[PDB]
Every structure is written in structure tokens, then in C-alpha cells.
Chloroplast membrane-associated 30 kD protein
Amino acid sequence: ERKYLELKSQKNLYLARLKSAIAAQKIEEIAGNLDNASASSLFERIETKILELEAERELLNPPPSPLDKKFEQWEEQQAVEATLAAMKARRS
Amino acid sequence: QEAPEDLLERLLGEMELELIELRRALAQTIATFKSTERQRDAQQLIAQRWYEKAQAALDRGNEQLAREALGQRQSYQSHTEALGKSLGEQRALVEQVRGQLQKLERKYLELKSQKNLYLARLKSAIAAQKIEEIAGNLDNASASSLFERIETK
Amino acid sequence: ILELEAERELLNPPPSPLDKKFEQWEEQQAVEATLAAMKARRS
Amino acid sequence: AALDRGNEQLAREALGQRQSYQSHTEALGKSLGEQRALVEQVRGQLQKL
Amino acid sequence: AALDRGNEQLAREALGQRQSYQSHTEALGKSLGEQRALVEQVRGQLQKL
């Protein structure tokens, strides 16, 4: 009995270990299913999907070259400067 | 095939079952060693009685009685030394797993948050997709067939 | 009981013994400082 | 009233006991302040509403 | 409050413990900034839409 009671105790300790290991196994597999590192297919798949969908939207309305962006600003710079130059000079 | 975003929420919901399973499974662990800890306490206390018997033996010059009482305690002491070391061995098991667990929720809660951010991104992208297709259906530029079709009409 | 006892403790992870002595120690400083000022106030 | 007549020891427990109430006081005092903004902000919202 | 009265040792653990929270703070602080552009860019898109 002295041996059996000890043996009966160890399994309960060890039964926990397999339960802990059992729980310690499912955590990693699910992490690899979708990973923040994007190595997992799902995270990159959907993220790339956004990029796949993102690119097509831009082309349908071909964005004007950066020239007008600076020019529309520049002419705005000339416009705002000319307006404020006249306005500030109007009430300098 | 099922939409990946539909599964997303389901996968996290399944995790807590293991977490609570570990919660109860881990709790079952704690009751083991402390129960043995109490069992050890009785044995050492019982051994102390044989020491209380051993110390009371030589009192009045009866040294012989202490020999058996102390000798008997050795069997309990033999259990004590064997049992004392055994308790120490498994403490690292609870220690290491506890450090693992605390980090595990720390990671999971963060992961659970990112999907909500990212679930928005697909929703924003989902909404950001239907806007362009309808625009090409009929366009003020007349490149779309309908606008020019009816206008030419 | 031990099986049920252990799970209760974890749900509210008890603060490390550091605050127990520190909350006492700062209380010791607080009580000593208060009584030091109070006893000195009406020494 | 403890140290009065030289009984300093009694004050130790009375003051020590007050710390528990003071512990509640500090915890409760801050809690009251936190929710005052809640009534303050909503009142400003309502009057405008 | 640790070094107060010359107990420098206690501050070591308290400050050391804060580093773990600070480690979260630095990691969490940067994360908040990253997603602000997401709401910023989409808002500009929407208003035009």
C-alpha cells in the first residue's frame, strides 16, 4: 500500500501534465492558422486581398499625376499669396 | 468555401474552452501537492511525537526507550526525506506553466484586439469596393455605356 | 474543498507579499509619521 | 484621548484602526471625484439639447 | 516612496516592476499611432465620397 498510494498520487500529478500538455498543444496550431506575423496564409491572404481590392479601385479613377497636386497647390500658393498680398496690402 | 472572416470570431471563441479547461485542470493540480503537504505535516508531526516520546524516554534515566522511539522515527524520517524532495520537484512545474499562461492571455487578448481592428479594415475595404464598380456602371465622364448610351439616345 | 479552494484564489490573483509588507511598511511610516507628528504636536 | 494621562499605547490601536477607515476614505474620496465629470459633461450636453 | 527614509532597495523592485508595464507601454504606445492614419485616410476618402 505504501508503494501503491504513492503511485496513485503520481498519476494525478502526471494526469495534469498530459492535460497541461494537451492544452499546451492546441494553442500553437491555432496560432499558426492565423498569425500576426503574416506568415500564416489567412492573415496575409485577407491582407493581400485588401491590397488586391485596393489597387483596382485606384485605376478606375486614374489619379492625376503629381504635377497638378503641386501645381494646384502652387497656383493656390500664387492665388492665396496674391489674394493675401492684395488683401494685406489693402489693409496693411 | 466558408468565408475566412466568418471563422475568425469562431476560432477565438473555441480557445476559451481550453483556457477554462486548463483553468480547472490546473486547479485540480494545486489541490494535489497541498493535500500531500498536509499529509507530510502529519508525518513530521507524528515523527515529533516519537521525538516527544524519545525526549521523554531518557527522562529519569530510561535511555533504552529513546532508542526505539528515535529508531522508529527514522522510518518516518525516511519517508520525510523522500517526500520532502518530491514536493520540491513539482514546484517548477506549476512555476513554469504559470509564467507560460500569464503570457498566453497577454498574447491572446492582444490578438483578439487586432482582429477587431482588422475586421474593420475588411469592412472598410468591402465598402471601398462597391463604390467603384457602381461608378463605372454609369459615369459622368460618359465613358460608361449607360451615360453615353442614353445621352447618345 | 482544496480543488474548489485553489480555483477561487487564482480568479483574483493575490498581490505578491511585497505590497503586504509595503502597505504595512508605508502604514508603519504613515502611522509612525502621523503619531510622530501627533505625539510631537502634544508631547 | 488615549495619550491623555500618559497612555500612549492606546492611541496606537485607535489611530491604527482609523487607517482602515482612512484606507476606505482615500479609495472612496477619489471615486466620488471621478463621476462628477459624468454629471458635468452630460448637463452641458442637455442644456444645449 | 521607497528611498524615502533611506530604503533604496525597495525602489529597485518597484521601478524594475514598472519596466514590464513600461515594456507594454512602449509596445502599446506605438501600436496606437499606427492605426491613426487608417482612420485619417479613410475619413478623407469618405468626405470626398
Q: What stands out?
A: Chains D and E do not touch (no CB pair under 8 Å). The radius of gyration of chain D is 20 Å. Residues 8-48 of chain D form the longest helix (41 residues). DSSP finds one helix and no strands in chain D.
